[PDB]
Coordinates of C-alpha atoms in Angstrom, one line a residue:
Chain W
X1 CA 43.4 32.7 -23.3
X2 CA 40.1 34.3 -22.4
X3 CA 38.1 32.3 -19.9
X4 CA 34.4 31.4 -20.6
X5 CA 31.8 29.8 -18.4
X6 CA 29.5 27.1 -19.6
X7 CA 26.3 26.3 -17.9
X8 CA 22.9 24.9 -18.4
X9 CA 19.5 26.1 -17.1
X10 CA 18.3 27.1 -13.6
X11 CA 17.1 24.1 -11.5
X12 CA 19.8 21.9 -13.1
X13 CA 19.0 18.4 -14.3
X14 CA 21.3 15.7 -15.6
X15 CA 21.8 17.0 -19.1
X16 CA 22.4 20.5 -17.8
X17 CA 25.2 19.4 -15.5
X18 CA 26.7 16.6 -17.6
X19 CA 26.6 18.5 -20.8
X20 CA 28.1 21.6 -19.3
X21 CA 31.0 19.4 -17.9
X22 CA 31.4 17.6 -21.3
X23 CA 31.5 20.8 -23.4
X24 CA 34.0 22.4 -21.1
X25 CA 36.3 19.3 -21.3
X26 CA 35.9 19.5 -25.2
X27 CA 36.9 23.2 -25.2
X28 CA 39.8 22.5 -22.7
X29 CA 41.2 19.6 -24.7
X30 CA 41.3 21.9 -27.7
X31 CA 43.4 24.4 -25.9
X32 CA 40.7 26.8 -24.8
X33 CA 39.8 28.1 -21.3
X34 CA 36.4 27.0 -20.0
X35 CA 34.7 26.2 -16.7
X36 CA 31.5 24.3 -16.4
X37 CA 29.3 25.8 -13.6
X38 CA 25.7 25.2 -12.3
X39 CA 23.0 27.6 -11.5
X40 CA 21.3 25.7 -8.6
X41 CA 21.1 22.4 -6.6
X42 CA 22.0 19.0 -8.1
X43 CA 19.3 16.5 -7.8
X44 CA 19.6 12.9 -6.8
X45 CA 19.6 11.5 -10.4
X46 CA 22.4 13.7 -11.3
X47 CA 24.2 13.0 -8.0
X48 CA 24.2 9.2 -8.8
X49 CA 25.7 10.0 -12.1
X50 CA 28.4 12.2 -10.6
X51 CA 29.3 9.9 -7.8
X52 CA 29.2 6.7 -10.0
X53 CA 31.8 8.3 -12.5
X54 CA 33.7 10.1 -9.6
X55 CA 33.2 13.7 -11.0
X56 CA 32.8 16.7 -8.9
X57 CA 29.8 18.9 -8.9
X58 CA 30.4 21.9 -11.1
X59 CA 30.9 25.1 -9.2
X60 CA 27.6 27.0 -8.2
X61 CA 27.2 30.5 -9.4
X62 CA 24.4 33.1 -9.3
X63 CA 25.9 35.5 -11.8
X64 CA 28.4 35.6 -14.6
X65 CA 29.4 39.2 -15.5
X66 CA 31.5 39.5 -12.4
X67 CA 33.6 36.6 -13.7
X68 CA 33.6 36.7 -17.5
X69 CA 32.4 38.6 -20.7
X70 CA 31.5 35.5 -22.6
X71 CA 29.4 32.4 -21.9
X72 CA 28.1 29.3 -23.7
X73 CA 24.7 27.9 -23.0
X74 CA 23.9 24.2 -23.1
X75 CA 20.5 22.6 -22.7
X76 CA 18.5 25.9 -23.0
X77 CA 18.2 29.3 -24.5
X78 CA 15.3 31.2 -23.1
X79 CA 16.6 34.0 -20.9
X80 CA 14.2 33.3 -18.0
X81 CA 15.7 29.7 -17.8
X82 CA 19.2 31.1 -17.9
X83 CA 21.6 32.9 -15.5
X84 CA 20.0 36.0 -13.8
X85 CA 22.5 38.4 -15.4
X86 CA 22.5 36.9 -18.9
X87 CA 21.9 40.3 -20.4
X88 CA 25.3 41.5 -19.0
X89 CA 27.4 39.0 -20.8
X90 CA 27.8 37.9 -24.4
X91 CA 26.3 34.5 -25.4
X92 CA 29.1 33.0 -27.7
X93 CA 27.4 29.8 -28.5
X94 CA 24.4 27.7 -27.6
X95 CA 24.2 23.9 -27.9
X96 CA 20.5 22.9 -27.3
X97 CA 17.6 20.7 -28.4
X98 CA 14.6 22.7 -27.1
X99 CA 12.3 25.3 -28.8
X100 CA 13.9 28.7 -29.2
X101 CA 12.1 31.8 -27.6
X102 CA 13.0 34.7 -25.5
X103 CA 16.6 34.7 -26.9
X104 CA 18.4 37.5 -28.7
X105 CA 21.9 38.4 -29.6
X106 CA 23.5 41.6 -30.8
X107 CA 25.9 39.6 -32.9
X108 CA 26.3 36.4 -34.9
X109 CA 27.1 33.3 -32.8
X110 CA 27.4 29.6 -33.1
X111 CA 24.0 28.3 -32.4
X112 CA 23.5 24.5 -32.7
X113 CA 20.2 23.0 -32.0
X114 CA 19.1 19.5 -33.2
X115 CA 15.9 17.9 -32.4
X116 CA 17.2 14.9 -30.6
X117 CA 16.8 13.7 -27.1
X118 CA 19.4 15.8 -25.2
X119 CA 22.4 18.0 -25.5
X120 CA 24.9 15.1 -24.8
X121 CA 23.9 13.4 -28.2
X122 CA 25.0 16.5 -30.0
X123 CA 28.2 16.9 -27.9
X124 CA 29.1 13.3 -28.8
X125 CA 29.1 14.3 -32.5
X126 CA 31.1 17.4 -31.6
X127 CA 33.9 15.4 -29.9
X128 CA 34.2 13.3 -33.2
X129 CA 34.1 16.2 -35.5
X130 CA 37.0 17.7 -33.4
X131 CA 39.2 14.6 -33.1
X132 CA 39.1 14.6 -29.3
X133 CA 39.0 11.3 -27.4
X134 CA 36.1 11.0 -24.8
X135 CA 37.4 9.9 -21.5
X136 CA 35.8 7.0 -19.7
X137 CA 34.3 9.2 -17.0
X138 CA 33.0 11.9 -19.4
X139 CA 31.3 9.3 -21.6
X140 CA 29.5 8.0 -18.4
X141 CA 28.2 11.5 -17.7
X142 CA 27.1 11.9 -21.4
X143 CA 25.5 8.5 -21.3
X144 CA 23.9 9.5 -18.0
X145 CA 22.3 12.6 -19.7
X146 CA 20.9 10.5 -22.6
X147 CA 19.3 8.0 -20.2
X148 CA 17.8 10.9 -18.2
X149 CA 16.1 12.7 -21.0
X150 CA 15.0 9.4 -22.8
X151 CA 13.9 7.6 -19.6
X152 CA 16.0 4.7 -20.7
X153 CA 15.2 4.9 -24.4
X154 CA 11.4 5.1 -23.9
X155 CA 10.5 8.7 -24.4
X156 CA 9.1 9.7 -27.9
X157 CA 11.9 12.3 -28.1
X158 CA 14.5 9.5 -28.1
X159 CA 16.0 9.4 -31.7
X160 CA 18.0 6.7 -33.4
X161 CA 21.0 9.2 -32.9
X162 CA 20.4 9.1 -29.2
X163 CA 20.4 5.4 -29.2
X164 CA 23.6 5.1 -31.3
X165 CA 25.2 7.6 -29.0
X166 CA 24.2 5.8 -25.9
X167 CA 25.7 2.6 -27.4
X168 CA 29.0 4.4 -28.1
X169 CA 29.3 6.0 -24.8
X170 CA 28.2 2.9 -22.7
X171 CA 31.1 1.1 -24.3
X172 CA 33.6 3.9 -23.6
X173 CA 32.2 4.3 -20.1
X174 CA 32.6 0.5 -19.4
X175 CA 29.0 0.1 -18.2
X176 CA 25.8 -1.7 -19.3
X177 CA 23.4 1.1 -20.1
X178 CA 20.3 -0.7 -18.9
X179 CA 21.7 -1.8 -15.6
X180 CA 23.4 1.6 -14.9
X181 CA 20.4 3.4 -16.3
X182 CA 17.7 1.8 -14.1
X183 CA 19.8 2.5 -11.1
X184 CA 20.3 6.2 -12.1
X185 CA 16.7 6.7 -12.7
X186 CA 15.6 5.1 -9.5
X187 CA 18.0 7.3 -7.6
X188 CA 16.2 10.4 -8.9
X189 CA 12.8 8.9 -8.2
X190 CA 13.8 8.3 -4.6
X191 CA 11.4 11.1 -3.2
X192 CA 11.8 10.0 0.4
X193 CA 14.4 12.6 1.6
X194 CA 12.7 15.3 -0.5
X195 CA 10.6 18.3 0.8
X196 CA 7.7 19.5 -1.4
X197 CA 9.8 22.7 -2.1
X198 CA 12.5 20.4 -3.5
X199 CA 9.8 18.4 -5.4
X200 CA 8.5 21.4 -7.2
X201 CA 11.7 23.0 -8.1
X202 CA 14.3 20.1 -8.8
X203 CA 13.3 20.0 -12.4
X204 CA 11.2 23.2 -12.9
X205 CA 11.3 25.3 -16.0
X206 CA 9.6 28.6 -16.8
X207 CA 8.0 29.6 -20.1
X208 CA 6.0 32.3 -21.7
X209 CA 3.2 30.7 -23.7
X210 CA 1.6 33.4 -25.8
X211 CA 1.1 36.1 -23.2
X212 CA 0.8 33.8 -20.3
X213 CA 3.5 33.1 -17.7
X214 CA 3.8 29.3 -16.9
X215 CA 6.0 27.1 -14.8
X216 CA 6.3 23.3 -15.6
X217 CA 7.9 21.2 -13.1
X218 CA 8.6 17.5 -13.6
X219 CA 9.3 14.8 -11.0
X220 CA 10.1 11.1 -11.6
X221 CA 8.6 8.4 -9.4
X222 CA 7.9 4.7 -9.4
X223 CA 4.5 5.3 -7.5
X224 CA 2.4 8.4 -8.3
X225 CA 0.4 7.6 -5.0
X226 CA 3.3 8.5 -3.0
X227 CA 3.5 11.9 -4.5
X228 CA -0.2 12.3 -4.6
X229 CA -0.6 11.8 -0.8
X230 CA 1.3 15.1 -0.4
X231 CA -1.0 17.0 -2.5
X232 CA -2.1 19.6 0.1
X233 CA 1.5 20.3 0.8
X234 CA 2.3 20.4 -2.8
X235 CA -0.6 22.9 -3.5
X236 CA 0.7 25.0 -0.7
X237 CA 4.2 25.6 -2.1
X238 CA 3.0 25.7 -5.7
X239 CA 0.4 28.5 -5.0
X240 CA 3.0 30.4 -3.2
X241 CA 5.1 30.4 -6.4
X242 CA 2.0 31.1 -8.5
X243 CA 1.6 34.4 -6.5
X244 CA 5.3 35.3 -6.3
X245 CA 6.0 34.9 -10.0
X246 CA 2.6 36.1 -11.2
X247 CA 2.0 32.9 -13.1
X248 CA -1.0 32.1 -15.0
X249 CA -0.2 28.3 -14.5
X250 CA 2.1 26.1 -12.6
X251 CA 1.8 22.6 -13.9
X252 CA 3.5 19.7 -11.9
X253 CA 4.1 16.6 -14.0
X254 CA 4.5 13.6 -11.9
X255 CA 6.0 11.0 -14.1
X256 CA 5.8 7.3 -13.5
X257 CA 9.0 6.0 -15.0
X258 CA 7.6 2.4 -15.1
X259 CA 4.3 3.1 -16.9
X260 CA 5.4 6.1 -18.9
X261 CA 2.3 8.1 -17.8
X262 CA 2.1 11.3 -15.8
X263 CA -0.2 12.7 -13.3
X264 CA -0.7 16.5 -13.8
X265 CA -1.4 18.9 -10.8
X266 CA -2.4 22.3 -12.3
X267 CA -2.7 25.3 -10.2
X268 CA -3.5 28.8 -11.5
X269 CA -6.0 30.9 -13.4
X270 CA -5.3 28.9 -16.6
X271 CA -5.6 25.4 -15.1
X272 CA -8.6 24.6 -17.5
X273 CA -6.4 25.0 -20.4
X274 CA -4.7 21.7 -19.3
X275 CA -8.1 20.0 -19.8
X276 CA -8.2 21.5 -23.3
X277 CA -4.6 20.6 -24.1
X278 CA -4.8 17.0 -23.1
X279 CA -8.5 16.4 -23.6
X280 CA -8.8 15.4 -19.9
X281 CA -10.9 16.3 -16.9
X282 CA -9.3 18.0 -13.9
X283 CA -10.7 16.6 -10.7
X284 CA -9.4 18.1 -7.4
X285 CA -6.6 19.8 -9.6
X286 CA -5.4 16.6 -11.2
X287 CA -5.7 14.4 -14.2
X288 CA -3.8 11.4 -15.7
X289 CA -2.0 12.3 -18.8
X290 CA -1.6 9.0 -20.7
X291 CA 1.8 8.3 -22.5
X292 CA 2.9 11.9 -21.5
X293 CA 6.5 12.0 -20.5
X294 CA 8.2 14.9 -22.5
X295 CA 7.8 18.5 -21.6
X296 CA 9.2 19.8 -24.8
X297 CA 7.3 17.5 -27.1
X298 CA 4.2 16.5 -25.4
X299 CA 3.4 19.4 -23.0
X300 CA 4.8 22.7 -24.3
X301 CA 3.2 22.8 -27.8
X302 CA -0.3 21.5 -26.9
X303 CA -0.5 23.9 -23.9
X304 CA 0.6 26.8 -26.2
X305 CA -2.1 26.1 -28.6
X306 CA -4.7 25.7 -25.8
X307 CA -3.6 29.0 -24.0
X308 CA -3.7 31.0 -27.3
Chain C
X1 CA 6.2 16.2 -47.5
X2 CA 6.7 19.3 -49.8
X3 CA 8.6 22.1 -48.2
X4 CA 9.8 25.5 -49.4
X5 CA 13.2 26.9 -48.7
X6 CA 13.8 30.6 -48.8
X7 CA 16.1 33.5 -47.7
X8 CA 15.0 36.9 -46.6
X9 CA 13.0 39.8 -48.1
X10 CA 15.0 41.8 -50.6
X11 CA 16.9 38.9 -51.9
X12 CA 20.8 39.2 -52.1
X13 CA 23.1 36.6 -53.5
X14 CA 23.4 34.3 -50.5
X15 CA 19.8 34.3 -50.0
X16 CA 19.0 33.2 -53.5
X17 CA 22.0 30.9 -54.1
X18 CA 21.9 29.0 -50.8
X19 CA 18.1 28.5 -51.0
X20 CA 18.9 26.7 -54.4
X21 CA 21.8 24.8 -53.0
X22 CA 20.1 23.7 -49.9
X23 CA 17.0 22.5 -51.9
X24 CA 19.4 20.7 -54.2
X25 CA 21.0 18.9 -51.2
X26 CA 17.6 17.9 -49.7
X27 CA 16.3 16.6 -52.9
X28 CA 19.5 14.6 -53.6
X29 CA 18.8 13.0 -50.1
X30 CA 15.3 12.0 -51.3
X31 CA 13.3 14.7 -49.6
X32 CA 10.9 17.1 -51.4
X33 CA 12.0 20.7 -51.4
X34 CA 11.7 23.7 -53.7
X35 CA 13.9 26.9 -53.4
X36 CA 11.8 30.2 -53.5
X37 CA 12.4 33.9 -53.3
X38 CA 10.6 36.6 -51.6
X39 CA 11.3 39.6 -54.0
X40 CA 13.3 40.9 -57.0
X41 CA 16.8 39.7 -57.8
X42 CA 19.4 42.3 -58.0
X43 CA 22.1 42.7 -60.7
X44 CA 24.8 40.8 -58.8
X45 CA 22.6 37.8 -58.2
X46 CA 21.4 37.9 -61.8
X47 CA 25.1 37.9 -63.0
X48 CA 25.6 34.8 -60.9
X49 CA 22.4 33.0 -62.1
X50 CA 23.2 33.8 -65.7
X51 CA 26.8 32.6 -65.5
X52 CA 25.8 29.2 -64.1
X53 CA 22.9 28.9 -66.3
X54 CA 20.3 28.7 -63.5
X55 CA 16.9 30.2 -63.3
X56 CA 15.5 32.4 -60.6
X57 CA 13.6 30.6 -58.0
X58 CA 9.9 31.1 -58.1
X59 CA 8.6 34.1 -56.4
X60 CA 6.0 33.6 -53.6
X61 CA 4.2 36.0 -51.3
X62 CA 3.0 33.4 -48.8
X63 CA 3.8 29.8 -47.9
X64 CA 0.8 28.3 -45.8
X65 CA -1.3 27.9 -48.9
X66 CA 1.3 25.6 -50.4
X67 CA 3.1 23.9 -47.4
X68 CA 3.0 23.4 -43.8
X69 CA 6.7 23.4 -43.2
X70 CA 9.5 25.7 -44.3
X71 CA 13.3 26.0 -43.9
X72 CA 14.9 29.4 -43.7
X73 CA 18.3 30.3 -45.0
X74 CA 20.3 33.5 -44.5
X75 CA 17.9 34.9 -41.8
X76 CA 15.7 34.2 -38.9
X77 CA 14.0 37.4 -37.7
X78 CA 10.3 37.4 -38.5
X79 CA 10.3 40.7 -40.1
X80 CA 12.9 39.7 -42.7
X81 CA 11.0 36.6 -43.4
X82 CA 7.8 35.5 -45.5
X83 CA 4.6 37.5 -44.6
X84 CA 2.8 34.4 -43.2
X85 CA 5.8 32.9 -41.4
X86 CA 3.6 32.5 -38.3
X87 CA 1.2 30.3 -40.3
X88 CA 3.8 27.8 -41.0
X89 CA 6.2 25.7 -39.0
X90 CA 9.8 26.4 -39.3
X91 CA 11.6 23.1 -39.6
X92 CA 15.1 24.3 -40.0
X93 CA 17.3 27.5 -40.0
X94 CA 20.8 27.6 -41.6
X95 CA 22.1 31.2 -40.9
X96 CA 25.1 33.3 -39.8
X97 CA 23.4 36.4 -38.5
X98 CA 22.4 37.6 -35.0
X99 CA 19.2 35.9 -33.7
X100 CA 16.2 38.2 -32.7
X101 CA 12.5 38.2 -33.3
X102 CA 12.4 34.4 -33.7
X103 CA 10.5 31.8 -31.7
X104 CA 9.4 28.2 -32.4
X105 CA 6.7 26.2 -30.6
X106 CA 8.8 23.0 -31.1
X107 CA 12.3 21.9 -31.1
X108 CA 14.0 22.2 -34.6
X109 CA 17.2 22.0 -36.5
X110 CA 18.9 25.5 -36.0
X111 CA 22.4 25.8 -37.4
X112 CA 24.1 29.3 -37.2
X113 CA 27.8 29.6 -37.5
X114 CA 29.6 32.9 -37.3
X115 CA 31.0 32.5 -40.8
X116 CA 30.9 34.8 -43.8
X117 CA 27.8 33.4 -45.4
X118 CA 25.2 30.6 -45.5
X119 CA 26.8 28.9 -48.5
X120 CA 30.0 28.2 -46.4
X121 CA 27.8 26.2 -43.9
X122 CA 26.1 24.4 -46.7
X123 CA 29.3 23.4 -48.2
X124 CA 30.3 21.7 -45.0
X125 CA 26.7 20.1 -45.1
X126 CA 27.2 18.4 -48.6
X127 CA 30.3 16.7 -47.2
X128 CA 28.7 15.6 -43.9
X129 CA 26.0 14.0 -46.1
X130 CA 28.4 12.8 -48.9
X131 CA 26.7 14.4 -51.7
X132 CA 28.6 15.8 -54.7
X133 CA 28.1 19.5 -55.5
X134 CA 27.0 19.9 -59.1
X135 CA 29.4 22.3 -61.1
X136 CA 26.7 25.1 -61.4
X137 CA 25.5 24.8 -57.7
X138 CA 29.1 25.1 -56.8
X139 CA 29.3 28.4 -58.7
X140 CA 26.3 29.7 -57.2
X141 CA 27.8 28.9 -53.6
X142 CA 31.1 30.5 -54.7
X143 CA 28.9 33.6 -55.7
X144 CA 27.3 33.7 -52.3
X145 CA 30.9 33.5 -50.6
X146 CA 32.2 36.2 -52.9
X147 CA 29.1 38.5 -52.5
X148 CA 29.1 38.5 -48.7
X149 CA 33.0 38.6 -48.5
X150 CA 33.5 41.3 -51.1
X151 CA 36.2 39.0 -52.8
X152 CA 37.7 37.9 -49.4
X153 CA 38.2 41.5 -48.0
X154 CA 35.3 41.7 -45.4
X155 CA 36.4 41.2 -41.8
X156 CA 33.5 38.6 -41.6
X157 CA 35.6 36.3 -44.1
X158 CA 36.9 33.3 -42.2
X159 CA 39.4 30.6 -43.0
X160 CA 36.4 28.4 -43.7
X161 CA 34.9 30.8 -46.2
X162 CA 38.3 30.9 -48.0
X163 CA 38.6 27.0 -47.9
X164 CA 35.1 26.6 -49.2
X165 CA 35.5 29.2 -51.9
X166 CA 38.8 27.4 -53.0
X167 CA 36.9 24.1 -53.3
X168 CA 33.9 25.5 -55.1
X169 CA 35.9 27.6 -57.6
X170 CA 37.7 24.4 -58.6
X171 CA 34.4 22.4 -58.9
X172 CA 32.7 25.3 -60.9
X173 CA 35.8 25.7 -63.1
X174 CA 36.2 29.5 -62.6
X175 CA 39.0 31.7 -61.4
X176 CA 37.6 33.1 -58.2
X177 CA 39.3 36.6 -58.6
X178 CA 38.3 37.1 -62.2
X179 CA 34.6 35.8 -61.9
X180 CA 34.2 37.6 -58.6
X181 CA 35.3 41.0 -59.7
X182 CA 32.8 40.8 -62.7
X183 CA 30.0 39.5 -60.4
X184 CA 30.6 42.2 -57.9
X185 CA 30.9 45.0 -60.6
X186 CA 27.6 43.8 -62.2
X187 CA 26.0 44.5 -58.8
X188 CA 27.8 47.9 -58.5
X189 CA 26.2 49.2 -61.8
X190 CA 24.0 51.9 -60.3
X191 CA 23.2 53.6 -63.8
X192 CA 19.8 52.1 -64.8
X193 CA 18.8 51.9 -61.1
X194 CA 16.2 54.0 -59.6
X195 CA 16.7 55.5 -56.0
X196 CA 13.7 53.4 -55.0
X197 CA 15.8 50.4 -56.2
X198 CA 18.9 51.6 -54.5
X199 CA 17.4 51.8 -51.0
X200 CA 15.6 48.5 -51.3
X201 CA 17.7 46.1 -53.3
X202 CA 19.7 45.1 -50.1
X203 CA 17.7 46.5 -47.3
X204 CA 17.0 44.8 -43.9
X205 CA 15.0 45.7 -41.1
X206 CA 15.8 45.2 -37.5
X207 CA 14.6 46.3 -34.0
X208 CA 17.4 47.6 -32.1
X209 CA 16.4 47.8 -28.5
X210 CA 13.1 49.5 -28.6
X211 CA 14.1 51.4 -31.8
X212 CA 12.7 50.3 -35.4
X213 CA 15.6 50.6 -38.0
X214 CA 16.2 49.7 -41.6
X215 CA 19.7 49.4 -42.9
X216 CA 20.2 49.2 -46.6
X217 CA 23.5 48.6 -48.4
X218 CA 24.5 49.3 -52.0
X219 CA 27.9 48.4 -53.6
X220 CA 29.7 51.0 -55.7
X221 CA 33.1 51.6 -57.2
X222 CA 32.6 55.4 -56.9
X223 CA 30.8 56.7 -53.8
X224 CA 30.6 60.2 -55.4
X225 CA 28.2 58.9 -58.2
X226 CA 25.6 57.9 -55.7
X227 CA 26.4 60.8 -53.5
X228 CA 25.2 63.1 -56.5
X229 CA 21.7 61.6 -55.9
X230 CA 21.6 62.5 -52.2
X231 CA 18.4 64.8 -52.6
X232 CA 16.6 62.1 -54.4
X233 CA 17.8 59.5 -51.9
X234 CA 16.6 61.5 -49.0
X235 CA 13.2 61.7 -50.5
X236 CA 12.6 58.0 -50.9
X237 CA 14.3 57.2 -47.6
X238 CA 12.2 59.9 -45.7
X239 CA 9.1 58.4 -47.2
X240 CA 10.0 54.8 -45.8
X241 CA 10.9 56.3 -42.5
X242 CA 7.4 57.9 -42.2
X243 CA 5.5 54.9 -43.7
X244 CA 7.2 52.3 -41.4
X245 CA 7.6 54.4 -38.3
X246 CA 11.3 54.1 -38.4
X247 CA 13.6 55.6 -35.8
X248 CA 16.5 55.4 -38.2
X249 CA 17.1 54.5 -41.9
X250 CA 20.8 54.1 -42.6
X251 CA 22.0 53.7 -46.2
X252 CA 25.4 52.2 -46.3
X253 CA 27.1 53.1 -49.6
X254 CA 30.0 50.6 -49.8
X255 CA 33.1 51.1 -52.0
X256 CA 33.9 47.5 -52.9
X257 CA 37.5 48.4 -53.7
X258 CA 38.6 50.7 -51.0
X259 CA 36.6 48.7 -48.2
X260 CA 35.0 52.0 -47.1
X261 CA 31.5 53.1 -46.7
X262 CA 29.5 56.3 -46.9
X263 CA 26.7 56.5 -44.4
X264 CA 23.6 58.4 -45.0
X265 CA 21.5 58.6 -41.9
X266 CA 17.8 59.8 -41.8
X267 CA 15.4 59.7 -38.7
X268 CA 15.1 60.8 -35.2
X269 CA 18.1 58.6 -34.1
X270 CA 20.5 59.7 -36.9
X271 CA 22.9 61.1 -34.2
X272 CA 23.4 57.7 -32.8
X273 CA 25.4 57.0 -36.0
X274 CA 27.9 59.5 -34.8
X275 CA 28.2 57.8 -31.5
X276 CA 28.3 54.3 -33.0
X277 CA 31.1 55.0 -35.4
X278 CA 32.9 58.0 -33.6
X279 CA 32.1 60.3 -36.7
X280 CA 30.5 63.5 -37.4
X281 CA 27.5 63.7 -39.7
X282 CA 27.8 66.5 -42.3
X283 CA 24.7 67.0 -44.3
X284 CA 23.4 63.6 -43.1
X285 CA 26.6 61.7 -44.2
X286 CA 29.8 60.5 -42.7
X287 CA 32.6 58.2 -44.3
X288 CA 32.8 55.0 -42.2
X289 CA 36.5 53.9 -42.7
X290 CA 36.8 50.1 -42.9
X291 CA 33.1 49.6 -42.4
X292 CA 31.7 47.0 -44.8
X293 CA 29.8 44.5 -42.8
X294 CA 26.1 45.2 -41.6
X295 CA 26.0 42.1 -39.2
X296 CA 29.4 42.5 -37.6
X297 CA 30.4 46.3 -37.9
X298 CA 27.0 48.1 -38.1
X299 CA 24.3 46.3 -36.2
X300 CA 26.2 45.8 -32.9
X301 CA 27.7 49.2 -32.3
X302 CA 24.3 50.8 -33.5
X303 CA 22.6 48.6 -30.9
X304 CA 24.9 50.0 -28.1
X305 CA 24.7 53.5 -29.2
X306 CA 20.8 53.4 -29.3
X307 CA 20.3 51.7 -26.0

């Protein structure tokens, strides 16, 4: 039975890891042959989820074509967010909830995107459509992904489907969603053991907006001040990436998970487009983005219009 | 609140019927939708529309002057879509083709399934939503399945297409084989058709790698009747190739009974058809044995051959 790899994006975050694992489990329980893999380091928020439900980290890979002919993408589609040799394998399926860009197939495929809060909310539907029982631990991972991408049901991308799925999965997982969730989020906001290199890359995503190359990284915190004090070190690693990747903008979004506001740190030739996008004034490369917690909904589209 | 729902340019039966069917589904769910079309309906689709007593959807050229949001069925690629697609928001796509030349600013509902046509997906969507399919909508969806499967002979026809067709034929009240042959043959009537109509009635544009292509298909019960108009076909095709800067125009002349196609290839990359199908072009043509499906049996091998 032909082997496939399932993976999320570069710089893996909780949905990318947990949805890879969940979808491979769904494929395997249906008699197929799938391995969840990951494309980079597991962050602390995902580590808490993996440790709590006693699941191993997916195997790390840099390429797929040496292993398989066919892959499934979860939690992304854009080539530059994907495995470095994506053009050498066939994308059989994509399960996702982001905008579509920089993605092309030679052939028809199963492409399933729904504008909900995360991939795990779609996978929950798919288990039910396929009459496959969700194990306790898988449900905990899928619940973990929903909490992560909704910031405990606070993000404006959180839909009623996400809430309903979290309720089902918390019950299957045997945990109280708010208690577990707070602890998971706090574990990823523990920025004490983290270098600035880790801070700008743990949850970083590349995009092309119009003709401009951008990178938007996100970090969660309970105190924006404790990130802000590392600004000079942050601008040093950021401007190094800006040069290396020829970016027009690197935007770091430092998210206060208590207040649901973010401090932006914008470096690059197009930094002023951030002022236009958010109606905000950059002072010493930063500005408070009030209520802004979601990259796909509150950053990407307004930045696209601004840079156009 | 008002949205338009349409298929691709040069409408074929799935593109007309699934726009109508999905609009029906949305309206029954209390939303505000109208099915539209982007060009002329062919004879096959007209048969379907006549048989189930449905009018042709309204013809539009643009959308941003009426609505802000649209739903695409049966396609995604910008160049197959409405001329001002970049002016509107694509809310949803329901499709069964390769994805290319398609980008959104925002998350959306994108549902592609590698089945025989869009109507097979929409059949599943009526059930998911618990909405009855009216008799005539069912006949239009059956039409779409028969059209794209060539009466269940195409290798793109899946078990899901077969099962949907059996449910829809029973709701519509027709014998699928009897009605299907007649619908197919109505589209295979090439007599009163000009060559301009032959190369455009079911023509789709693609970019394959860097190469600009157009691949058009016509159904026939005698390949030799359309082959007798080769000189005339070569003049209208040559004109399109120059006007649109095509590297390749490929006319696929499909024998709907024998499941074979005659290729007619014009343009700088005409020799890639030889490589793609392991055939030899004789006077710009070659018989493509068993080749019936553009999305599954033409576009991918051509893409490889042209890379």
